[PDB]
C-alpha cells in the first residue's frame, strides 16, 4: 500500500480528543428535535440571570429561609455597616452559592463587571435613605459611612424606588481575575449603610427586610475548565 509511518501518539487514548468513530447503529431513524423553550448555548449565560444572595449565613440563619433576609433592625446611628460583602465571588462563603458563583466553581479565571440589585420589602408607607457602596481591590473594609461615601456608591431612596442596581465595575490588575481560593484576592466591597435612619408611618411592624440579587454581565468570561465532585 501507500508508504506509511506510525509516529508518537499512536495507540494512545486522549480523553480530550476529537476523532471520528464507527457508528454502532447504521441508518437509525433518529427522532428529530422540537423547539422546546429555553435552549442554552453557553454556561456564562446562566450567570447573567439575577440570583438571590444569602447575606446572613449566621449559625442559626445559614441553610434556612432567613439566610436570604437582611433585617433592618433598630440600632445606633453607629456607622457600623448594615451588611458588608467581599467581592471575592469564590473566596467568600456567601457569594459562592449563587448561580453566578456556581459557574465560578468550574474555572480558574473570570473577568468583567457584576451587578448587585436589592429589592426593598418594607411597608410602602415608610421612608428613609440608604447608601450602597463599593471599594476597589485592596482597601480596608470601609467601616464608617464617611469612608464608604468616598468610593463608588449610589444613594438608594427607599421611599421612591423599591429596587436598586449598583454595577461593580471591572477594576482589576490582570486581564483574567483569579477565581481560585487565594489569600486575600481583591475584590470589591458591596455594602449598604444607614444614610439616615428609617422613617416609619403610623404603626408598621418597624422591621422589614431587603433581598439581594447578583448576576454577571455580557463582558463576563471564564477559562481553564477545572472541577471537583465527591
Amino acid at each position: 500500500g501507500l508508504p506509511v509511518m506510525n509516529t508518537p501518539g499512536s495507540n494512545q487514548y486522549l480523553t480530550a480528543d476529537n476523532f471520528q468513530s464507527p457508528c454502532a447503529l447504521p441508518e437509525f431513524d433518529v427522532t428529530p428535535p422540537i423547539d422546546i423553550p429555553g435552549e442554552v448555548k453557553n454556561m456564562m449565560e446562566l450567570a447573567e440571570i439575577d440570583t438571590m444572595i444569602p447575606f446572613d449565613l449566621s449559625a442559626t440563619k445559614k441553610n434556612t429561609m432567613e439566610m436570604y433576609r437582611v433585617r433592618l433592625s433598630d440600632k445606633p446611628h453607629t456607622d457600623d455597616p448594615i451588611l458588608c460583602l467581599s467581592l471575592s465571588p469564590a473566596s467568600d462563603p456567601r457569594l459562592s452559592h449563587t448561580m453566578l458563583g456556581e459557574i465560578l466553581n468550574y474555572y480558574t479565571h473570570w473577568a468583567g463587571s457584576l451587578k448587585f440589585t436589592f429589592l426593598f420589602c418594607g411597608s410602602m408607607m415608610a421612608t428613609g435613605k440608604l447608601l450602597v457602596s463599593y471599594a476597589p481591590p485592596g482597601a480596608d473594609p470601609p467601616k464608617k459611612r464617611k469612608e464608604a461615601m468616598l468610593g463608588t456608591h449610589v444613594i438608594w431612596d427607599i421611599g421612591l424606588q423599591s429596587s436598586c442596581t449598583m454595577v461593580v465595575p471591572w477594576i482589576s490588575n490582570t486581564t483574567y481575575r483569579q477565581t481560585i481560593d487565594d489569600s486575600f484576592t481583591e475584590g470589591g466591597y458591596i455594602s449598604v449603610f444607614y444614610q439616615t435612619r428609617i422613617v416609619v408611618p403610623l404603626s408598621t411592624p418597624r422591621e422589614m427586610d431587603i433581598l439581594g440579587f447578583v448576576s454577571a454581565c455580557n463582558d463576563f468570561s471564564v477559562r481553564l475548565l477545572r472541577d471537583t465532585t465527591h
Epitope: 449566621s58 433592625s73 455597616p81 451588611l83 458588608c84 467568600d92 480596608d140 473594609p141
Partner: nanobody, 122 residues
C-alpha cells in the same frame, strides 16, 4: 473552608467572668477579624464584642460596655473574649464569627461556630 472552634464556654456565676477563644483554620485569623454574638434563647442574635486583627480598635455593645473586654493574638491564631461582671440575662447561646471587621451587625461575618452556652446564674 475555615472552621474556628468556640472554646472557654462554661456555666459560671452572677458578677463573675469567663474567657472565651476561637482558633483559626483555612486562613490566619489576622486577615479577617473576629467577634461574638450571644443569641439569647428565643430572641435574635445579640452583638457583644468585636476587634480587628491587623488594626486593633475594639467595639462593644452598650448593654455590656465597660464591663466586657475582647483581645487578640494573631500569632497564636486565637481570639480572646473577656466577659466580665456576668449577670442572669448574660445567659445566652454564645457564638464567635469572622467578618469585616470588627462591626457587631447581626452578620458581616462569614464562618461562625457551634454555639457555646454560658449559664451565668447557674
Amino acid at each position: 473552608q475555615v472552621q474556628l472552634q468556640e472554646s472557654g464556654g462554661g456555666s459560671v456565676q452572677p458578677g463573675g467572668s469567663l474567657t472565651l477563644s476561637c482558633a483559626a483554620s483555612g486562613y490566619a485569623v489576622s486577615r479577617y477579624s473576629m467577634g461574638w454574638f450571644r443569641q439569647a434563647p428565643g430572641k435574635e442574635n445579640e452583638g457583644v464584642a468585636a476587634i480587628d486583627s491587623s488594626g486593633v480598635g475594639t467595639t462593644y455593645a452598650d448593654s455590656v460596655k465597660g464591663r466586657f473586654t475582647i483581645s487578640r493574638d494573631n500569632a497564636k491564631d486565637t481570639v480572646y473574649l473577656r466577659m466580665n461582671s456576668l449577670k442572669p440575662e448574660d445567659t445566652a447561646i454564645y457564638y464567635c464569627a469572622s467578618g469585616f471587621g470588627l462591626s457587631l451587625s447581626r452578620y458581616t461575618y462569614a464562618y461562625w461556630g457551634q454555639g457555646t452556652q454560658v449559664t451565668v446564674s447557674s
